[PDB]
């Protein structure tokens, strides 16, 4: 068993975490439990405070002079570690290994919260990633309001994710009538994995004398961003410009294969991606699972995926929503290019 460790530049504070991927179940988020190690000194008349903050950084300025930081908080939780719920197995083992100067902290995440989604920065950028980020900050203070120096503090980036549900969803179907040009479309399944190809049926029948001459199929990413007002960003991640046509009073059935990936969608600035601990690259942002009916507006970034087929008549289009998730890992995701450099 191996646990993560980060220390402050001062060298008097260190936060021990055992995992950095706290999985969000639709109604129960995993708890952020850990242990902070402090010298017998440096705490004679002070207190240890651990703060878990979720931010929605939307600009790479970071200038705390005139409000030019663009690091608005979304959920702030504060706990008291040094001044004295049952401890978990990880906290008990960490305390025994470290010693008596080991104070455990536990955070509970309320449900219906945004996950770690970071927009694609772009080639010529040297700033922080834009998106929802979860930050674990531990410092030493006795008033909870005095300014804390960067040297005398510990900051750790944790990532909350959602994985594919065990039970597969219903098969997506769609059909619209236009004047008739009946267009039917359906996928093979509802839950898809990253890199797994998507098969769509474009079985279409035509009855009018008008003839189509172009079939357009695309997979679009629906990143609902809401901080000041409700906004929706639609970016296509897959493209297939077929040149199939159907004669009047005849049918046409075909199966098309699509696969979204980041190699071609690299120049698309602002594209939603998974949470990034560092400047390393990550795959496309997964979908966001939300409670049915019992969920209000989620202030943050919500990622949705819809594949559409369009009959360019000279247009009739339908929407097929699908779910893109990573499968449940065995041990843990590394959050890094495993063959670095």
């Amino acid at each position: 068993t191996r646990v993560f460790k980060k220390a402050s530049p001062n060298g008097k504070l260190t936060v021990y975490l055992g995992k950095r991927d706290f999985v969000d179940h639709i109604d129960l988020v995993d708890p952020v439990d850990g242990v902070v190690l402090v010298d017998p000194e440096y705490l004679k008349e002070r207190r240890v405070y651990v703060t878990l903050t979720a931010a929605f950084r939307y600009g790479r300025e970071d200038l705390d002079v005139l409000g030019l930081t663009f690091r608005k908080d979304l959920f702030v939780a504060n706990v008291q570690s040094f001044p004295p719920k049952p401890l978990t197995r990880l906290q008990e083992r960490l305390i025994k290994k470290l010693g008596e100067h080991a104070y455990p902290f536990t955070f509970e995440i309320p449900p219906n919260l945004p996950s770690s989604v970071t927009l694609q920065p772009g080639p010529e950028d040297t700033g922080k990633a834009i998106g929802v980020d979860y930050e674990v900050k531990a410092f030493v203070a006795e008033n909870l309001e005095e300014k804390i120096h960067k040297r005398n503090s510990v900051r750790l980036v944790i990532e909350k994710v959602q994985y594919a549900p065990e039970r597969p969803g219903p098969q997506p179907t769609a059909e619209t009538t236009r004047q008739p040009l009946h267009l039917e479309a359906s996928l093979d399944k509802e839950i898809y994995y990253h890199g797994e190809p998507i098969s769509v049926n474009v079985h279409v029948t035509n009855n009018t004398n008008k003839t189509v001459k172009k079939i357009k199929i695309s997979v679009r990413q629906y990143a609902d961003i809401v901080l000041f007002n409700t906004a929706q960003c639609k970016v296509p991640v897959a493209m297939e410009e077929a040149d199939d046509t159907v004669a009047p009073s005849s049918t046409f059935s075909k199966v098309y294969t699509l696969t979204p990936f980041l190699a071609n969608n690299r120049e698309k600035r602002g594209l939603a991606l998974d949470g990034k601990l560092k400047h390393e690259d990550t795959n496309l942002a997964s979908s966001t699972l939300l409670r049915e009916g019992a969920n209000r507006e989620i202030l943050g970034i919500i990622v949705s995926y819809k594949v559409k087929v369009k009959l360019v008549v000279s247009d009739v289009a339908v929407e097929l929503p699908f779910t893109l998730m990573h499968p449940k890992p065995k041990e843990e995701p590394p959050h890094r290019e495993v063959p670095e450099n």
Partner: single-chain antibody, 222 residues
Framework: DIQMTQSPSSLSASVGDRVTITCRAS??????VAWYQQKPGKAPKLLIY???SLYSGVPSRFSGSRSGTDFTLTISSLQPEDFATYYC?????????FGQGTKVEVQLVESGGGLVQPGGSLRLSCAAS????????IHWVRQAPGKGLEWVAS????????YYADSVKGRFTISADTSKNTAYLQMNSLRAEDTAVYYC?????????????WGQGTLVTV
């Protein structure tokens, strides 16, 4: 780079005893260490993919442990069908290095390969079935006659990244065909030291967990 030296070079034992192969890493790498078993005349086959996690399919008698950089592989009982060469491999960096080899005493098909004069060109086709190109990573590993495995090149079609070994940079190139699900390796300026058995290995593109599947062998003589 990172170099590994294995304490047992030639191990002799009987049936019904516990053996222990020791692996040491030059640099303080994480638990990203994999163990492979290669029977004579057969491609290496993965046993442990995280230096502590047992692969699906292998017998439970195999085990692994880590202490700093002291990776070890232990077998509870040396069964008759266990005599092979065991290799220690890390995957924390692009220049992956295999162990020197300890001796105990979804189909991938590779095309091409043959007698090529020095300075010539040769292309190998790696037909891949059962997995998708974008959901997997394709690697080429060569094994010289009587020597250990050596990594050549790797391609990740999801991020569009290609890597090559320092000894084959420029001369060697790698490509993958999405429509045919085939990986191609074109060789230029073949030197006399390229005589090796080339294996096309497949690994999970997301959260690399060792080379799950290997090829059959396309020994090239120059």
């Amino acid at each position: 780079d990172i170099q590994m030296t294995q304490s047992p070079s030639s191990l002799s034992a009987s049936v019904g005893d516990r053996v222990t192969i020791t692996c040491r890493a030059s640099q303080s790498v994480s638990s990203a260490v994999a163990w492979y078993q290669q029977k004579p005349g057969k491609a290496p086959k993965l046993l442990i993919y995280s230096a502590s996690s047992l692969y699906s399919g292998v017998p439970s008698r195999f085990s692994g442990s880590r202490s700093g950089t002291d990776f070890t592989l232990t077998i509870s009982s040396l069964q008759p069908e266990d005599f092979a060469t065991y290799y220690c491999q890390q995957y924390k960096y692009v220049p992956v290095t295999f162990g020197q080899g300890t001796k105990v005493e979804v189909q991938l098909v590779e095309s091409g390969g043959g007698l090529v004069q020095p300075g010539g060109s040769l292309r190998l086709s790696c037909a891949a079935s059962g997995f998708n190109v974008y959901s997997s990573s394709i690697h080429w590993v060569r094994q010289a006659p009587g020597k250990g495995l050596e990594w050549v090149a790797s391609i990740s079609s999801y991020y569009g990244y290609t890597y090559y070994a320092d000894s084959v940079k420029g001369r060697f190139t790698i490509s993958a065909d999405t429509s045919k699900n085939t990986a191609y390796l074109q060789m230029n300026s073949l030197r006399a030291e390229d005589t090796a058995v080339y294996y096309c290995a497949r690994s999970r593109q997301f959260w690399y967990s060792g080379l799950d599947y290997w090829g059959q062998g396309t020994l090239v003589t120059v």
